[PDB]
Design a protein around this ligand. Structure first.
Ligand SMILES: [Cu+2]
Ligand SMILES: [Cu+2]
Ligand SMILES: [Cu+2]
Ligand SMILES: [Cu+2]
Ligand SMILES: [Cu+2]
Ligand SMILES: [Cu+2]
Lengths: 333, 333, 333
């Protein structure tokens, strides 16, 4: 009987950060309460000033990472304010039935709804908008995020021993398909109803114009670079709701990787690069051993360095010359 | 000595259905006899009435699913009637030698051939046409299917315990590359010899115009939706002879998945989405827990909802509010 | 203390061959010394005579395969002769820190450098050039290879028993993006500075014009076909530094496959086709059971047979009719 269970309210944070949680469950099963507010907003996605009409959960691309434990109940209040123009809903890949919740959460502007589901399977999972007839347009306008369902006793390695992370980050990777005119410049749009047929044509090329982490080219760089220290254990959750990606930490590895994100399976070890299929979230665990700047990329390097799918880690600490050293620095012959 | 073995004749059925077989072998090894007749035919593949000249095994796209057990012999009589115009053959990925049988099965119109091979490796495998110089054109015109080689003691989970399916379906996913004129309309063709250079150009874009399940947009919907009941265990075999796909059951999971389809490996558990590489068959096992409509899609959602790679399950039975419920139905604020 | 360790000089060989090494380590840890010389050179990549300005390690596409054991040190002397025009460097995915060595190995024409790193993780790994701002252009001009870090006790199967190969080959698969004019003919270029913006535009299509093994259409055919004998155990290392591929041995299998190439993980068994993600090296082990010609392809068959990603094995020995036979040869009805 669910009314006898503790309720706990979570206050979400903006990606790439993740709200407070406990790896090993300190309580029995709970109803974990979340609220998200849908926001249709203009977003500038590149250095050139290209502006799209984004569709977001909670104002960000990606949507925030939700964290629960196996056999908790997730209760989501989903709000669509009357300042929006479109119908929206939510499909959780973590959930069982009704199109992942999609059939039960259709909200017009000015409406809200509350969905509850039991988190029966441990893993990282995609969530996304999926309104009938408009699914890829909403997803590829930014309306997707992820949920992590931890095992009650936390993460384990391939031998069943504990793995504990010191820091966690959520990297949402987004493919955008900005319509172009015949000369190749991006088109602008007044009403999404007028945008719609050009959006479809752009999608049908299967060729994204931009592929970004955290909603924009360069979003996870400079002052917004991810951070760690030598010796810290970092979990990076990565999602792609529509298109395959292949993350790689330049100068590191995925020590333990769940490429398709499901924690009942043993992790793959020592990965250089891993494939996260479109419609999937994955997770990689790494212990940093060297200080300095690392690039975290989709290792289609064109997608990374030309289309935007690259971020940075800045790592503090002590350089290890046993692991790597310049024996003779670059010099003339 | 093969002449001492029982022979059994199989009568094939049209996908997505699968011919009668036993999961656990009730006999010793057998010679299992199949017949297929090649048919070049016009097929309408979308709602707009786009018509292609398809190349088929047994009149369908995909070709039928053949089912044997490990260490059975497969004996295939392949017939190319003189009403066809092209040379064809067959490559079984399940087989060892002679280009999977391709080098031994070249049949002109008016010819037949009989190939035998031993099914030494358990799994689901692609078969396809592969005539020298014309391989991708035949494959991408529909001339591919799959074969399932069951272990003699049936399927097992990750702990070596039995997994028994109540129903099985075969979903063949087909990428088509229909030639387009400069304005973007599909071109029509008299003789495949006149079609050939435009077919090559269309393929070289690497951008399919249609991606369909069971030979057409909407083929696995309405009266032709897949069915199950709450509590039933369903195996879905999925093949893609040319191009990667990423199946997802919207509102469900892959409880046990062999993404690359080979049953000596343990299955991956609790998958949301899995990657089947082009040139591969995979298999996913799910026990339905909720009634209603489910969408089964390639989770590149553009490929699903715009290009055609989506089908439906209709599931009867009892709704489970513990797993999912609407707490507050969509309403104004 | 590294100065107390044995040093061993390796003399590299051109792909697809691999330099001499021992599967099981016959010594303790060593400093293994390699030299590579960068060469910018014109390469003809197809039957039509299309010529590109390639960028190579040691004169070949791919670069040579380097082979060490776990916990050896790799010491690479990298030479950029003053006959080249561009700045280059090297990122080893096998290495830990400084962008895989990229930050410590920037060499102008007329310079050299010597990098040392400890090979802490066993597997096959990509190496590639990665100069700041120019990464995909260098990689997709051919400047990539692979390194194999064997476990000290050699390869093991899924049960921990030894796997010993009799022959090893290295297949580097390269996506090229040759710029085209509006009519579709390939453009030619004087200075790479003048080529640069057209190279970027060609890459941004995400549609390679050529995909080749060992640097050219048909490179691994005829007199340069790979060879084996019935009963021989062959390891094929395959890399793709930028783009996903899906190798398949037509008429065979991958008996043991490390699709993402990391030997601490058990191999996948009996694969028909496997996915190597872009930015990854993989390895497949097969024992040949039948003589004749086999095609080794990327099983996107358009990529194979139209764009160039196909090679041949020629296998000598004894035909096994139990495994496969023509019962009735192709004939009229
Ligand atoms: Cu929406
Ligand atoms: Cu989905
Ligand atoms: Cu054919
Ligand atoms: Cu094939
Ligand atoms: Cu370079
Ligand atoms: Cu790299």
């Amino acid at each position: 009987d669910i009314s006898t269970l503790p309720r706990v309210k979570v206050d979400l944070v903006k990606p790439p950060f993740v709200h407070a949680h406990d790896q090993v469950a300190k309580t029995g099963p709970r109803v974990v309460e979340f609220t998200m507010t849908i926001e249709e907003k203009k977003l500038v996605i590149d250095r050139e000033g290209t502006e799209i009409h984004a569709m977001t959960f909670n104002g960000s691309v990606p949507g925030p990472l939700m964290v629960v434990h196996e056999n908790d109940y997730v209760e989501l209040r989903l709000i669509n304010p009357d300042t929006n123009t479109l119908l929206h809903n939510i499909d959780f890949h973590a959930a069982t039935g009704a199109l992942g919740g999609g059939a039960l959460t259709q909200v017009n502007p000015g409406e809200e709804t509350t969905l509850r589901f039991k988190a029966t399977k441990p893993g990282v999972f995609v969530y996304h908008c999926a309104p009938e007839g408009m699914v890829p347009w909403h997803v590829t306008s930014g309306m997707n995020g992820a949920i992590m369902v931890l095992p009650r006793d936390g993460l384990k390695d391939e031998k069943g021993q504990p793995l504990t992370y010191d820091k966690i980050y959520y990297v949402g990777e987004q493919d955008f398909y900005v319509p172009k005119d015949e000369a190749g410049n991006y088109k602008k749009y007044e009403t999404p109803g007028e945008a719609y047929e050009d959006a479809v044509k752009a999608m049908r090329t299967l060729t994204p114009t931009h592929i970004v982490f955290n909603g924009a080219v360069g979003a996870l760089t400079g002052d917004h670079a991810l951070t760690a220290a030598v010796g810290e254990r970092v979990l990076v959750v990565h999602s792609q709701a529509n298109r395959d990606t292949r993350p790689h930490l330049i100068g590191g590895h995925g020590d333990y990787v769940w490429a398709t994100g499901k924690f009942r399976n043993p992790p793959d070890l020592d990965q250089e690069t891993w494939l996260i299929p479109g419609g999937t979230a994955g997770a990689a665990f790494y212990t940093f051993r060297q200080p300095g700047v690392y690039a975290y990329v989709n290792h289609n390097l064109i997608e990374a360095f030309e289309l935007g799918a690259a971020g940075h880690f800045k790592v503090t600490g002590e350089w290890n010359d046993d692991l790597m050293t310049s024996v003779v620095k670059p010099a003339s012959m």
